[model samples]
Target: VLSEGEWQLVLHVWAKVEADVAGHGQDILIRLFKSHPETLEKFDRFKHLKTEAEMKASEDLKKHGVTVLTALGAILKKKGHHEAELKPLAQSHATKHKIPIKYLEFISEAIIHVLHSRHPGDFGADAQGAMNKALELFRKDIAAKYKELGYQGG
Candidate 1:
């Protein structure tokens, strides 16, 4: 649950990141893959993308970053009304990608690291906590469908 101020902070941070989608958006995913190579291995599409240059070169990576973040933007836009709306996204991952729910939390952690590295002053502990909660809630909401299926296992 986000307080009013936390929501505003999330919106502000997202707007900053969204403006530079070609960079910030892609960076978040790259950070995830870099920090957790196993996460990258799980995706057949990204398995060969061992280097940042390789990952960034693939238009597939860019598109996936955009789609993932935009879907998240839509959830944030709903302002606390996201659980039901997130189900389809959850199902998409489970049914199509075989991506386990655990990666959702991993991505959140990676994104937080990116935010801190990119905007240190703007992202203090308070802001970090809020975004952490925001991302975890996002994972939980989306992972509900995965939970229902007993996990497809990536």
Candidate 2:
């Protein structure tokens, strides 16, 4: 639940991950379209959106913006088209960072929790709700993985 301009900050963070996930973005897009066809054409082309041109207005970018955005799971879910779109992201996340898998998983869960604390439409509410939903589904996907019956935990 931030001011209007705040989403840009989160998007900036997402931009960084765009490079990390890299070539797989199109795969992510396909996954999203498969499950959430409603959002297939939601975005204007990045060039036409003027986001690339107005780097000046978007200069307040921070290092952990993506971290913060990930912390807001609901918002991320809304941006996707299908549940499968997140597979590569979760996989890359597990491998790239040196942090413990449990902690990484915790952060994923934390992102979802943060969303629950905010106003439903806090991040442009309806405008970005789809991203939020996408993230939420993935978060639960992780949760369900661990929740499965097991003897001693890993």
Candidate 3:
């Protein structure tokens, strides 16, 4: 439930990135992998990639990136009020994928890093704050679901 002002800033910043979601999403994942190489093992499609060039050339990676960004875009469109959407995503990751919750933190950081790097001027303090709040809410909801599912590896 973002305030109207927060929603405006968040949506405005999002508009700048929405046109190239796949590219930006891939950039975010690349940054995450670069920062925490261990996290690469979590992705079945990308675990085989050993170099930056290989990662960049990965079609699987590109498609997954689009999936990630599309999901985020959906959440943003709802102004962070979509628990129904988050539930199954969290459940699958927790039970099936066994992805640690810390990876979500890393991804969130990577997303912010990508946004800031791409739109430093437009993504100022206010915009950043709004985005952070949205991401934080998302993380908390997912974490809660993880806890509810009895997964503790995060």
Candidate 4:
């Protein structure tokens, strides 16, 4: 759970990030692949893109990154009523993408890292804590779908 102040902080920063969604989203993906190189193995399309510039320049990566940030922007827009919205996305990632819960977890981490790096003074300990807790809730909601399908992992 997050305090109203924390939610405000998240929304403010998220809004700024989405102001240039394509660029920031691509940046997030690039940072993720760079920091955790092995994560690219999950995507056949991205696996061959070894360099950050290659990943950022790929049209597929740009499109997918924009899709993710767009959905996330919607969630943040209706934060008070986002669970219903997020549930379907979670289900799709679990069943269609067949992605492990950890991948979603990593995304949250990557977002956090980028936010802190871009706006160092904006995300203090309390804000970071709130972000982690909220992201964990999102992760759990998604992971539950996999569990319902009797998936042991991934």
Candidate 5:
């Protein structure tokens, strides 16, 4: 539901994100965990990490980070037609991961914070707004799927 201008701005910012997708993904997850330490319990692979240093140095965390960004990249490639891609992810997160939909908001905020911190020149107010809207759409899509599956709390 983005205007052409907003879409263009998002793509422009996304270009920078793609340049170092793994690093940004890791940074985003680190930021998320920093702000919401309790969320760490949600990750079996990373829950054992007792400190930020451990989180950052974990290769599993790094690979999961890459997976997160790669999923987002796929969503972007589909543009507004990402329902098909998001559905299964929503299902798995709800049924298997037991993650709350609220965590999506945390991740969305972390993404914006990481991107802005790393590329202030590209992630200006306008671009940030555009990105937030896009993330909101993505969040809503997942929430809808959660509801359809009769999954509660997500």
Candidate 6:
């Protein structure tokens, strides 16, 4: 645990997002990160994340772990369905982090950003809007993946 000074310092930065994202504020966060790179300093995950673990994990996770979002993305790539996998994870993770769904999108973007950076051709602002668009398309594919197994509308 941190001392009071550390907690206070954390609070100083953290309180701002709370204040900013008071209601539907994560949307602003997405806007800020995509539109303005400088404001990332104010971000908590950007501030204190030990992402070396996540960096390695995401790479391996892609091949094996198969969390809902990645699984959905794969199905989308292979087939064509619209189950909206990450959004549910976004909702769940938001509750886990006690933040807004928009914040979950921010976190998702960060995850995608890291992967994109690690594999330059795979993910980037280089493609700009491409990743988000692809993700939506992947969600559509997720529904197809389920349908193939006769999960629904069977």
Whose lDDT is greatest here?
Answer: 3
Q: Any runs in candidate 6 off by more than 4 Å, and if so which? A: 1-69, 78-80, 84-99, 122-126, 136-154
List, in order, the clash count of every candidate structure: 0, 22, 0, 0, 0, 4
Q: How many angstroms is residue 6 displaced in model 5 relative to the true structure, after the best TM-score fit?
A: 1.1
Candidate 4 steric clashes: 0
Q: Candidate 2 vs. truth: CA RMSD?
A: 15.4
Cα deviation at 79, candidate 2, in Å, is: 7.2
- Residue-wise lDDT of candidate 2 within 19-60, one digit each (tens)? 643222333333333344433333333222233233223322
> How well is each residue in 15-107 modelled by candidate 5, as lDDT tens digits?
998898888978999999999887888898788888878888998998999999888878876666898899888888888877787898999
- Which lDDT tens digits does candidate 3 get at residues 3-112? 99998888898898888988898899999999998899888778889888888899889899999888888888888777888888888798778888788889989988
Candidate-wise lDDT, in order: 0.79, 0.38, 0.87, 0.75, 0.86, 0.39
- For lDDT, candidate 3 versus 4, the one ahead is 3
- Global CA lDDT computed for model 5: 0.86
Per-residue C-alpha lDDT of model 4 across residues 1-154, encoded as one tens digit per residue: 5668767877877767867888888888888777777677777888888777788789999998899888877776665467677767866766666767777777888989887887678777877786776677667765665676665446
lDDT of residue 91 for candidate 3: 81
* lDDT for 122 (candidate 4): 70
Task: Give candidate 6's error at residue 133 in angstroms.
Answer: 2.0
Residue 111 of model 3: what lDDT?
88
TM-score-superior candidate, 2 or 3: 3
What TM-score does prediction 1 earn?
Answer: 0.88
Candidate 3: worst-modelled 10 consecutive residues by lDDT: 145-154
Which 10-residue window of candidate 4 scores lowest in summed lDDT?
145-154
Deviation of model 5 at 66, angstroms: 0.5
